[PDB]
Design a protein around this ligand. Structure first.
Ligand SMILES: CC[C@H](C)CN(C[C@@H](O)[C@H](Cc1ccccc1)NC(=O)OCCN1CCNC1=O)S(=O)(=O)c1ccc(OC)cc1
Lengths: 99, 99
């Protein structure tokens, strides 16, 4: 699709049979989801945003279907204000900015 | 133009005698610039992201040129680590997400 920006670019994602709403976020390198359970091993990581640093759990090679498009990649889980889809997965679905 | 997301979507903006590098950020409602001593009235504001909130100064009707596209709107100035072009100006320069 083509998505304009007068509203937040929120889309439905599928991650483990679970549907969630997430924000397409070109200013985020990484995909960060609110606290949830995901299967498999994770690694403790820290990431920094506009307000400072948080602890997250890094899950690698996780399938995420984003508005009907498939990605498989890294998902960070932790106290983000909102679910965000970052560039690591936006690139996989062929997302670009255009003006 | 089309901007892929393999790297951070940094572009040149101008606000005064300052050309600056800034992220084209679809996850940002508002435009947030690194500390700069802009003239005119402003209002205090708090904005929140990963890590928590920061205090910023809200300046209205500030002309901002983004990649040779003119815009004019609200700019928030404060201790952000990166200049962020948010949706309030991205819409004015005709920016969309596409996949
Ligand atoms: C609530 C959703 C987002 C987390 C909001 N952020 C925009 C993000 O794109 C943010 C931009 C940013 C901020 C600081 C440093 C770098 C980039 N990206 C973000 O938090 O990315 C996390 C991954 N980080 C780690 C370092 N580089 C990254 O890309 S935000 O910068 O916090 C923000 C919040 C409010 C606002 O106006 C009201 C404008 C911007």
């Amino acid at each position: 699709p083509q998505i304009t920006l007068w509203k937040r670019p929120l889309v439905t994602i599928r991650i483990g049979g679970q549907l969630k709403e997430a924000l397409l976020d070109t200013g985020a390198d990484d995909t960060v989801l609110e606290e949830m359970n995901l299967p498999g091993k994770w690694k403790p990581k820290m990431i920094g945003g506009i307000g400072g640093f948080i602890k997250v759990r890094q899950y690698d090679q996780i399938p995420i279907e984003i508005c009907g498009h498939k990605a498989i990649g890294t998902v960070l889980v932790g106290p983000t204000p909102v679910n965000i889809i970052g560039r690591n997965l936006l690139t996989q679905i062929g997302c670009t900015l255009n003006f």
